[PDB]
Design a binder for this molecule. Structure first.
Ligand SMILES: CC[C@@H](C#N)NC(=O)c1ccccc1
Lengths: 237, 300
């Protein structure tokens, strides 16, 4: 059924699963036309498909050309996500195919289920979690590859860098979700926190800085502070 | 005009014949139903005074043989049977009519209700949905499950309605996933009409039989089947004009006849609101929408 706080350690067991998030698939800027009407201009997007256990991210870049001449783009975005996830599964060896796919928005359930009719033994699930994966485009290297794409392209990342060498997946996913929650609540503060010290760098093959265990505790504290804070600034508490 | 005699009425029972019904008291001198219109299917049906659960009954066509009812005290229901001795049957019926122990099928001359509810229903198709080939008539009750229900347990006693499933490979062409899921025209016109049903009359006939089972026996799989066949048409952008116009008439008379206090278990809010207000055919059911809004505005 649906994924929630109670069945949360299921994410880190040994049944292959993917989160799919479609928030950033159809992205637009809204602007005024010469005539003073409003119009949208689409910008590149991405499907955020993530193995929460391994950290493996299958970032499918959605080039604006996909949208040309199409109508009802928000609804088509859902079907396009579903088509691309199903092509991804089909590309994978049988022993790598997920046993479950958890979608972060319930509107993706029917689209994915229809595209996956060929995989009756792959469970398509919703979740009750308010996961912050939309903030993925606040990760500079991810944003950079999406905006530079000139054609459809799959880029493969490990969103945990090398963290799993030192922490469990459960701790890795908790860290990720805290970083992304922070980036979503106040991107500027969040990024300030992450880069303040110029002596901590981001390896070329990594997404986040090379913090020590002790430094990650401090960072994690600072992000929690931020998230409680902005919650006050917003609710006045 | 044909006759369904009753051997006797040993138990108190509410007897229905098509959309008419009447109370017979325990061991009341009752010997059947006369003046039944030829040319239509019919359904005789029963609700025991003691046990109002398990309403049951028999679909039949008097052109297909001489049928009578007889109570069985072992199995404890009124059973339909065929009399093969035509002379014995005429004699029995004539005696009972002379003694006036028969109720008359009470059709008002102006009244086309039954015809409109059964226009496309044929006994030969009923018998393929209700498989019991040794009899010319077909038994249905409240509890019988459908073939599709059994996929989600006794196959001999099932309703073999055409399986319809909007999220199935049959319904969805590879590579037309979005197109076929949002516009079911393919599934309606090619798979179902051309492929399975052959023509819209067999389609409407199953649809009407599903409703009647749903209304008369509160059969839940039948109600599901009726709504599914409606939804498949309403969700198809391309439907022959003649089918839409006939659907409007079909549904109109079902809604008109559906008793008011049975509507909340026999009407699916989601399907009706979608069909009437969201679907491709939202503008093509003028009569059905008008009666629904005047009679069941709550559902909408
Ligand atoms: C959902 C209620 C349903 C059931 N079972 N129907 C009847 O009882 C009934 C009886 C006689 C005529 C019409 C309707």
């Amino acid at each position: 059924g649906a994924m929630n706080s109670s069945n949360y350690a299921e994410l880190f067991n040994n049944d292959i699963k993917l989160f799919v998030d479609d928030t950033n698939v159809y992205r637009v800027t809204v602007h005024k036309t010469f005539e003073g009407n409003v119009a949208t201009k689409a910008i590149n997007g991405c499907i955020f498909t993530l193995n929460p256990k391994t950290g493996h991210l299958f970032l499918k870049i959605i080039h604006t050309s996909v949208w040309a001449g199409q109508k009802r783009l928000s609804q088509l975005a859902k079907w396009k996500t579903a088509e691309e996830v199903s092509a991804l599964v089909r590309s994978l060896p049988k022993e790598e195919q997920p046993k479950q796919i958890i979608v972060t928005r319930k509107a993706m359930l029917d689209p994915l289920e229809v595209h996956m009719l060929d995989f009756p033994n792959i469970a398509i699930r919703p979740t009750e979690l308010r996961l912050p994966f939309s903030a993925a485009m606040s990760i500079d290297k991810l944003s950079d590859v999406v905006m530079k794409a000139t054609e459809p392209q799959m880029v493969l990342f490990n969103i945990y860098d090398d963290w799993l060498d030192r922490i469990s997946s459960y701790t890795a996913f908790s860290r990720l979700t805290l970083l992304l929650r922070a980036l979503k609540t106040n991107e500027e503060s969040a990024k300030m926190i992450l880069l303040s010290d110029p002596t901590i760098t981001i390896k070329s093959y990594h997404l986040w800085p090379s913090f020590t265990d002790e430094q990650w505790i401090t960072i994690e504290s600072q992000m929690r502070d931020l998230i409680l804070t902005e919650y006050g600034r917003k609710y006045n508490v | 005009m044909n006759t369904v005699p009753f051997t006797s009425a040993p138990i108190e029972v509410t007897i229905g014949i098509d959309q008419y019904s009447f109370n017979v008291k325990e061991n009341q001198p009752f010997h059947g139903i006369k003046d039944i219109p030829i040319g239509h299917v019919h359904v005789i049906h029963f609700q025991h005074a003691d046990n109002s659960s398990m309403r049951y009954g028999y679909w039949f066509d008097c052109r297909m043989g001489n049928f009578y009812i007889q109570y069985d005290p072992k199995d404890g229901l009124y059973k339909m049977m065929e009399e093969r001795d035509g002379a014995k049957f005429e004699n029995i019926v004539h005696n009972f009519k002379e003694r006036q122990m028969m109720v008359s099928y009470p059709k008002i001359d102006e009244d086309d209700t039954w015809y409109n509810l059964t226009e496309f229903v044929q006994m030969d198709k009923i018998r393929k949905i209700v498989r019991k080939d040794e009899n010319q008539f077909s038994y249905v009750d409240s509890s019988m499950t459908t073939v599709q229900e059994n996929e989600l347990s006794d196959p001999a006693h099932s309703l073999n309605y055409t399986v319809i499933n909007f999220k199935s490979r049959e319904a969805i062409r590879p590579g037309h996933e979005m197109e076929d899921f949002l516009d079911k025209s393919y599934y309606l016109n090619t798979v179902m009409l051309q492929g399975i049903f052959k023509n819209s009359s067999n389609y409407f006939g199953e649809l009407q039989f599903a409703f009647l089972n749903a209304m008369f026996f509160g059969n839940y799989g039948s109600s599901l089947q009726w709504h599914a066949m409606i939804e498949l048409i309403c969700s198809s952008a391309t439907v022959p004009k003649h089918m839409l116009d006939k659907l409007d008439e079909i549904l109109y008379y079902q809604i008109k006849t559906l008793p008011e206090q049975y509507s909340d278990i026999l009407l699916n809010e989601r399907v009706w609101n979608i069909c009437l207000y969201s679907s491709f055919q939202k503008n093509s059911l003028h009569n059905t929408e008008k009666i629904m809004e005047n009679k069941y505005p709550e559902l909408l």
